[PDB]
mmCIF file of all heavy atoms in Angstrom:
data_model
loop_
_atom_site.group_PDB
_atom_site.id
_atom_site.type_symbol
_atom_site.label_atom_id
_atom_site.label_comp_id
_atom_site.label_asym_id
_atom_site.label_seq_id
_atom_site.Cartn_x
_atom_site.Cartn_y
_atom_site.Cartn_z
ATOM 1 N N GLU A 50 -15.356 4.515 -1.567
ATOM 2 C CA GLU A 50 -14.917 3.220 -0.958
ATOM 3 C C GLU A 50 -15.064 3.230 0.565
ATOM 4 O O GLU A 50 -15.386 2.203 1.200
ATOM 5 C CB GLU A 50 -13.406 2.947 -1.293
ATOM 6 N N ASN A 51 -14.839 4.432 1.203
ATOM 7 C CA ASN A 51 -14.904 4.677 2.649
ATOM 8 C C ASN A 51 -16.246 4.306 3.287
ATOM 9 O O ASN A 51 -16.286 3.605 4.319
ATOM 10 C CB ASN A 51 -14.692 6.204 2.873
ATOM 11 N N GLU A 52 -17.310 4.735 2.717
ATOM 12 C CA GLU A 52 -18.674 4.475 3.257
ATOM 13 C C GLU A 52 -19.096 3.044 2.821
ATOM 14 O O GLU A 52 -20.143 2.534 3.371
ATOM 15 C CB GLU A 52 -19.640 5.514 2.768
ATOM 16 N N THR A 53 -18.370 2.473 1.895
ATOM 17 C CA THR A 53 -18.744 1.049 1.477
ATOM 18 C C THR A 53 -18.480 0.154 2.580
ATOM 19 O O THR A 53 -19.250 -0.774 2.982
ATOM 20 C CB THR A 53 -17.905 0.623 0.254
ATOM 21 N N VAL A 54 -17.336 0.443 3.247
ATOM 22 C CA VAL A 54 -16.839 -0.328 4.430
ATOM 23 C C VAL A 54 -17.997 -0.180 5.483
ATOM 24 O O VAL A 54 -18.562 -1.261 5.879
ATOM 25 C CB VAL A 54 -15.553 0.278 4.986
ATOM 26 N N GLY A 55 -18.299 0.966 5.895
ATOM 27 C CA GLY A 55 -19.359 1.209 6.925
ATOM 28 C C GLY A 55 -20.719 0.493 6.766
ATOM 29 O O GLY A 55 -21.360 0.150 7.731
ATOM 30 N N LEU A 56 -21.113 0.321 5.497
ATOM 31 C CA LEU A 56 -22.363 -0.308 5.156
ATOM 32 C C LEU A 56 -22.293 -1.888 5.354
ATOM 33 O O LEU A 56 -23.241 -2.475 5.829
ATOM 34 C CB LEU A 56 -22.738 -0.049 3.666
ATOM 35 C CG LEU A 56 -23.330 1.365 3.323
ATOM 36 C CD1 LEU A 56 -23.693 1.415 1.886
ATOM 37 C CD2 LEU A 56 -24.471 1.772 4.263
ATOM 38 N N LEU A 57 -21.156 -2.410 5.024
ATOM 39 C CA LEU A 57 -20.895 -3.876 5.301
ATOM 40 C C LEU A 57 -20.662 -3.954 6.788
ATOM 41 O O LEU A 57 -20.724 -4.981 7.445
ATOM 42 C CB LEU A 57 -19.840 -4.474 4.423
ATOM 43 C CG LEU A 57 -20.123 -4.418 2.931
ATOM 44 C CD1 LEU A 57 -18.870 -4.662 2.163
ATOM 45 C CD2 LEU A 57 -21.201 -5.314 2.601
ATOM 46 N N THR A 58 -20.174 -2.825 7.365
ATOM 47 C CA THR A 58 -19.914 -2.737 8.776
ATOM 48 C C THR A 58 -21.128 -2.145 9.330
ATOM 49 O O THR A 58 -21.156 -1.222 10.230
ATOM 50 C CB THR A 58 -18.734 -1.741 9.009
ATOM 51 O OG1 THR A 58 -17.599 -2.212 8.333
ATOM 52 C CG2 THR A 58 -18.428 -1.673 10.472
ATOM 53 N N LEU A 59 -22.325 -2.588 8.796
ATOM 54 C CA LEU A 59 -23.591 -2.112 9.347
ATOM 55 C C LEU A 59 -24.194 -3.122 10.302
ATOM 56 O O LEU A 59 -24.377 -4.288 9.902
ATOM 57 C CB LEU A 59 -24.607 -1.747 8.190
ATOM 58 C CG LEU A 59 -25.884 -0.987 8.530
ATOM 59 C CD1 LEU A 59 -25.568 0.423 9.077
ATOM 60 C CD2 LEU A 59 -26.762 -0.869 7.313
ATOM 61 N N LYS A 60 -24.286 -2.737 11.547
ATOM 62 C CA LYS A 60 -24.842 -3.647 12.613
ATOM 63 C C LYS A 60 -26.451 -3.598 12.594
ATOM 64 O O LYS A 60 -27.025 -2.510 12.420
ATOM 65 C CB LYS A 60 -24.325 -3.262 13.979
ATOM 66 N N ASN A 61 -26.996 -4.722 12.799
ATOM 67 C CA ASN A 61 -28.416 -4.868 12.859
ATOM 68 C C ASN A 61 -28.928 -3.901 13.963
ATOM 69 O O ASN A 61 -30.109 -3.393 13.867
ATOM 70 C CB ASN A 61 -28.813 -6.289 13.224
ATOM 71 C CG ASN A 61 -28.656 -7.190 12.009
ATOM 72 O OD1 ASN A 61 -29.297 -7.111 11.057
ATOM 73 N ND2 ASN A 61 -27.821 -8.229 12.170
ATOM 74 N N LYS A 62 -28.179 -3.618 14.954
ATOM 75 C CA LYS A 62 -28.640 -2.745 16.060
ATOM 76 C C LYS A 62 -28.683 -1.256 15.765
ATOM 77 O O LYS A 62 -29.095 -0.466 16.603
ATOM 78 C CB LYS A 62 -27.951 -2.992 17.331
ATOM 79 N N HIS A 63 -28.239 -0.824 14.556
ATOM 80 C CA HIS A 63 -28.337 0.640 14.191
ATOM 81 C C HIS A 63 -29.439 0.822 13.187
ATOM 82 O O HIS A 63 -29.586 2.016 12.701
ATOM 83 C CB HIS A 63 -27.001 1.130 13.717
ATOM 84 N N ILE A 64 -30.189 -0.195 12.797
ATOM 85 C CA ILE A 64 -31.276 -0.154 11.854
ATOM 86 C C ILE A 64 -32.678 -0.018 12.414
ATOM 87 O O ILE A 64 -33.486 -0.959 12.375
ATOM 88 C CB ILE A 64 -31.322 -1.477 10.983
ATOM 89 C CG1 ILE A 64 -29.904 -1.868 10.539
ATOM 90 C CG2 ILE A 64 -32.213 -1.257 9.767
ATOM 91 C CD1 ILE A 64 -29.222 -0.923 9.606
ATOM 92 N N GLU A 65 -33.078 1.151 12.976
ATOM 93 C CA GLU A 65 -34.383 1.376 13.570
ATOM 94 C C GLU A 65 -35.553 1.009 12.615
ATOM 95 O O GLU A 65 -35.593 1.496 11.540
ATOM 96 C CB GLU A 65 -34.518 2.801 14.165
#
Side-chain angles (χ1 to χ4, degrees), residues 55-59 61 64:
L56 287 186
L57 298 166
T58 302
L59 192 64
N61 286 296
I64 317 295

